[model samples]
Target: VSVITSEMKIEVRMEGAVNGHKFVITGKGSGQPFEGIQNVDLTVIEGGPLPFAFDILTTAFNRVFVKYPEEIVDYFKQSFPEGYSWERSMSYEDGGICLATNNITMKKDGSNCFVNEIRFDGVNFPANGPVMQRKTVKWESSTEKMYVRDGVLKGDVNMALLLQGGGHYRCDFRTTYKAKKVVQLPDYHFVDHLMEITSHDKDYNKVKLYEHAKAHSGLPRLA
Candidate 1:
């Protein structure tokens, strides 16, 4: 008798709704999870500045990428005895502004998991009006789940950015994939592999999305 295993295909879908309008972007690629994903028509709704929506989308994807390492470390904490500890620090920047910073420390003997500490800086979006003076007043991020098991990596992330006045922005996305080879544990190269796969072709569709939003900015809203 012979045993054989085959590579698994990866699928990605990132979608959200703003002001009651919904939009979805999906990609299917192999070799690496999220590697095959590409951009799709993200122009879910029109009227009232679509660029801001695209910006939310871009940040949504970036949030997951930035927090993946933290998730990976947490996975290892699940089964360990309770005394092990490690520290992870990360920061995210956009358009020269540092949007968020995360300082997480995990201890396994691991009696209690350290709370993930995060610091957020006000974000500025020129497209949303009041260009320079007023900035984002509040930023919130929540991860419903992030873990790897049985050769599969899965994540769900939600984020919100609230402007100085009444404008509110929100984005949510879910990603999951099975690897070609079984991965019992994450290694040094795991993150790079995942990042490279996610970043394939210069992060193709997200950029296209911004451009699409900008090019079509003047269009009228749909009924």
Candidate 2:
């Protein structure tokens, strides 16, 4: 019948909302008038265990990404003129997985160049057992300044599980919706990296993952 068990078990408030900027003019106190740069930043957070929160969050991220999609597109075009590719193989030895290199290549569609395939080396697959597995997650953005300026938008789906047979599993999801814009002031031969939009939901929660081994780990039952 899908009845409500408890009356709103707990309250979760994804806090942190910010909107600010910083402007600086280099060559201050110099003879020549220095060009100033204006940087803007913004952040917004909302919380609710609502059933459709996932979908709403996804849509919100997509909208943010499109704002400056060309920034990333051009970055790839300029960085990898001929595209990029890396390759590595996997080796499972000693009945265990050995960290191997990864193989990746960029795909070109017309004038666009982007990641088409992702390969992770040294990661082993569960050979047997009712093992719960987590596949390779999507490539994440580096905290480097370049990628930071490009843009960022993500979501979180918190998790907390306590199993009888197994142990406990937990996860604390987060979100970030940030972006930047650039302006080249040719007159002063200066370039400005304006942090146009910067939003983050930093309501951190506990995250953990544990497992238990049964009597029959992974072997054939004998008579």
Query: Highest TM-score, which number?
Result: 1
Clashing pairs in 1: 29-36, 81-109, 82-108, 82-109, 82-110, 83-108, 83-109, 84-108
Q: For residues 39-106, what per-residue lDDT tens digits would candidate 2 score against the true structure?
A: 11212222222211111111111111011221132221122323322222212221322121112122
Q: Which digits, one per residue and each the tens of the lDDT, describe model 1 over residues 1-223?
A: 1011122222334444433334455443322112212222222222323323233434332111122333233232232222122221112123323233233332333232222233333243344343233344444534334455445555444545565677754544344433223234443222211111123122233333211100011223785
How well does model 1 score by local distance difference test? 0.31
TM match of model 2 to true structure: 0.19
Q: Highest lDDT: give the candidate number.
A: 1
User: For each candidate, what is the lDDT?
Assistant: 0.31, 0.20
Least accurate stretch of 10 residues (summed lDDT) in model 1? Answer: 209-218
Every model's TM-score: 0.27, 0.19
Q: Model 2, residue 46: displacement in angstroms?
A: 40
Cα deviation in Å at residue 84, candidate 1? 28
Q: Which portions of model 1 miss their true places by more than 4 Å?
A: 1-52, 60-144, 167-170, 177-180, 185-223
